[PDB]
Amino acid sequence: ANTSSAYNSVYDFLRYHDRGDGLTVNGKTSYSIDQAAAQITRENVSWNGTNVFGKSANLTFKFLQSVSSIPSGDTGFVKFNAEQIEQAKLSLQSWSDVANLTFTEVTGNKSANITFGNYTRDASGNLDYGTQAYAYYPGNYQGAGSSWYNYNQSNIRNPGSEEYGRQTFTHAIGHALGLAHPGEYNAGEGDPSYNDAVYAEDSYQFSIISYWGENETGADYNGHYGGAPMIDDIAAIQRLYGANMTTRTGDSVYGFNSNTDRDFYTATDSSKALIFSVWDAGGTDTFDFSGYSNNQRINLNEGSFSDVGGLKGNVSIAHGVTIENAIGGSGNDILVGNSADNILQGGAGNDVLYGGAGADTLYGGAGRDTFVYGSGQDSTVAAYDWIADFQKGIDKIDLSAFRNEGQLSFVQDQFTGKGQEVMLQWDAANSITNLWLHEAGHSSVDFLVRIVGQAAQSDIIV
Ligand SMILES: [Ca+2]
Ligand SMILES: [Ca+2]
Ligand SMILES: [Ca+2]
Ligand SMILES: [Ca+2]
Ligand SMILES: [Ca+2]
Ligand SMILES: [Ca+2]
Ligand SMILES: [Ca+2]
Ligand SMILES: [Cl-]
Ligand SMILES: [Cl-]
Ligand SMILES: [Zn+2]
């Protein structure tokens, strides 16, 4: 049916970066999260051995202070500096947050599963200012789990201020845990490019084990590097070691006002870029994106991507995660809930809110806001939505999606029985307006949105 542009914007955003299911994207086969995860783990190796899946591990790590040799043949060893140590520990933590891994530092002569060191020259003893980093897969051989970084790169020496350095630590540790590049390519071997990718979603938007920029898949991080595991990385590492169900099991806030004590989930002011895929194992959680003025699009569905703070495709939610609440900023935003009971706050600006299934509580904020309903299942009597700050003559409630079963008619105080009728009923004692919809094919009146405030018939879009 002809539906409104507000509904169409929800319908489209729900399908942003659709994947898998026999789609073709960028002329390549599109993989699901799980297909991408299987591809990233295709070497079938982990610290637990070969072809061992879903098994936790307790691992050691060490910052080498000297070496007998570097397993690649590079030379000019330099130990990690203090900033590299701090950032590497943050990278390790970002992996142990999502998978069932513990990391324990060892020093002195103790062997370690994962090691860190820098190099500066090739096997011929000439300075190497061109390469970046590499690491070795788990195994029982000499050098297994070791990771190596070019100290002549400023991003490697300064990973706390040069985002690519922190990303590189996360990437290399991923190899040291058993993850592979999503395609058969490597640095030094020819000149690969995204054109050589096996599947469309081989980019930083989905995996920081990729070589390819997030622009290759239509995302845009405005020159930033995220630094922590992205959505397919989380699925991949959980395939090997199991998911960590102890992480952030309380009510967690991501974005502004964050309580995660993780830099990559925290924006401290509006100039801060956020790039993350969230893992969260319990509790009632909030995406607080309130500090931005850009028009944002925020989706709470697991697996989905959001456009946050002026970037594109920079936030996603890992498979297995339920995030319950979202707060937009002063821009004109779209906030899309999931089947849970969501509290959505549009903030200032003219926002479109869609609770989806479940009993949602919606605040448009200042501005001309639109609360969208796509199905009778979005607001059943048994689990109805509240719209708590509705402004008569300014906000709108959009029922245009119901046109697909016949144009809805407005009735004043009684239903005829014909169905596809909408009624507003004012409760003067409580100052509540109940919006009732008797839907085609329903014998009883089964859709209700309760509104804290008055509403006019002309505020209801049918
Ligand atoms: Ca939580
Ligand atoms: Ca939750
Ligand atoms: Ca807003
Ligand atoms: Ca919902
Ligand atoms: Ca608003
Ligand atoms: Ca409003
Ligand atoms: Ca709902
Ligand atoms: Cl030169
Ligand atoms: Cl839903
Ligand atoms: Zn790599």
Side-chain angles (χ1 to χ4, degrees), residues 159-243:
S161 62
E162 300 186 32
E163 291 173 9
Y164 192 57
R166 174 68 169 284
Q167 183 166 294
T168 292
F169 288 175
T170 301
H171 178 111
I173 290 161
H175 292 318
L177 290 170
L179 307 181
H181 299 145
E184 288 291 326
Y185 49 74
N186 218 307
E189 305 176 6
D191 61 317
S193 76
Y194 175 83
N195 291 318
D196 303 317
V198 172
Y199 64 103
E201 296 79 8
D202 182 0
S203 84
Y204 292 156
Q205 176 182 359
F206 297 92
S207 176
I208 42 64
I209 321 295
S210 182
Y211 269 168
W212 321 122
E214 76 282 356
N215 55 114
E216 299 287 5
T217 50
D220 189 350
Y221 308 162
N222 194 32
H224 293 277
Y225 298 96
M230 290 293 247
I231 184 167
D232 291 354
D233 300 321
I234 292 170
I237 193 74
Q238 294 174 345
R239 172 171 166 97
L240 293 181
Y241 298 106

Side-chain angles (χ1 to χ4, degrees), residues 333 335 344-346 351-355 362-364 369-372:
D333 303 317
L335 274 68
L344 303 180
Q345 287 181 251
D351 301 300
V352 173
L353 274 54
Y354 170 87
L362 313 179
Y363 295 84
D369 297 301
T370 299
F371 304 90
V372 175

Side-chain angles (χ1 to χ4, degrees), residues 248-250 252 280 282 285:
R248 288 181 292 275
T249 59
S252 313
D280 183 297
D285 311 302

Side-chain angles (χ1 to χ4, degrees), residues 66-321:
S66 62
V67 298
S68 46
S69 68
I70 303 177
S72 54
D74 285 330
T75 64
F77 173 76
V78 176
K79 67 192 181 199
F80 260 35
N81 69 38
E83 183 175 327
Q84 297 183 298
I85 287 168
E86 179 60 13
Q87 296 290 308
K89 282 166 180 180
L90 294 176
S91 287
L92 288 163
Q93 177 176 65
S94 69
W95 286 110
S96 62
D97 275 355
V98 312
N100 205 156
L101 293 169
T102 62
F103 288 115
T104 300
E105 183 175 1
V106 301
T107 63
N109 312 51
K110 279 156 196 179
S111 64
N113 299 112
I114 296 178
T115 66
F116 295 89
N118 305 290
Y119 62 94
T120 46
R121 311 180 84 97
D122 57 29
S124 298
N126 299 317
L127 193 74
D128 170 2
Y129 63 76
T131 65
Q132 174 71 7
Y134 45 92
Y136 290 84
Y137 289 137
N140 295 302
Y141 62 94
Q142 197 72 295
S146 66
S147 69
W148 300 99
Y149 308 84
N150 187 339
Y151 207 65
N152 300 312
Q153 293 282 357
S154 64
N155 79 85
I156 291 299
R157 298 189 304 269
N158 305 317
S161 62
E162 300 186 32
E163 291 173 9
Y164 192 57
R166 174 68 169 284
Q167 183 166 294
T168 292
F169 288 175
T170 301
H171 178 111
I173 290 161
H175 292 318
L177 290 170
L179 307 181
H181 299 145
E184 288 291 326
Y185 49 74
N186 218 307
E189 305 176 6
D191 61 317
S193 76
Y194 175 83
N195 291 318
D196 303 317
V198 172
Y199 64 103
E201 296 79 8
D202 182 0
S203 84
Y204 292 156
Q205 176 182 359
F206 297 92
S207 176
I208 42 64
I209 321 295
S210 182
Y211 269 168
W212 321 122
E214 76 282 356
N215 55 114
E216 299 287 5
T217 50
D220 189 350
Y221 308 162
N222 194 32
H224 293 277
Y225 298 96
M230 290 293 247
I231 184 167
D232 291 354
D233 300 321
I234 292 170
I237 193 74
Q238 294 174 345
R239 172 171 166 97
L240 293 181
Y241 298 106
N244 187 338
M245 308 300 309
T246 69
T247 297
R248 288 181 292 275
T249 59
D251 282 12
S252 313
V253 182
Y254 296 90
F256 289 87
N257 306 304
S258 188
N259 59 2
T260 57
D261 190 29
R262 299 289 183 272
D263 59 352
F264 53 93
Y265 289 140
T266 299
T268 61
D269 67 53
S270 71
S271 69
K272 304 305 176 182
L274 288 171
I275 301 163
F276 64 78
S277 188
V278 57
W279 174 250
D280 183 297
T284 296
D285 311 302
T286 300
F287 273 1
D288 181 341
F289 300 147
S290 63
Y292 294 124
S293 59
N294 319 263
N295 293 346
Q296 308 184 81
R297 304 198 296 164
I298 300 165
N299 192 341
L300 296 189
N301 280 286
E302 72 175 310
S304 72
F305 280 86
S306 295
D307 294 321
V308 169
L311 290 58
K312 288 185 191 75
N314 53 312
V315 164
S316 65
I317 295 169
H319 180 248
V321 176

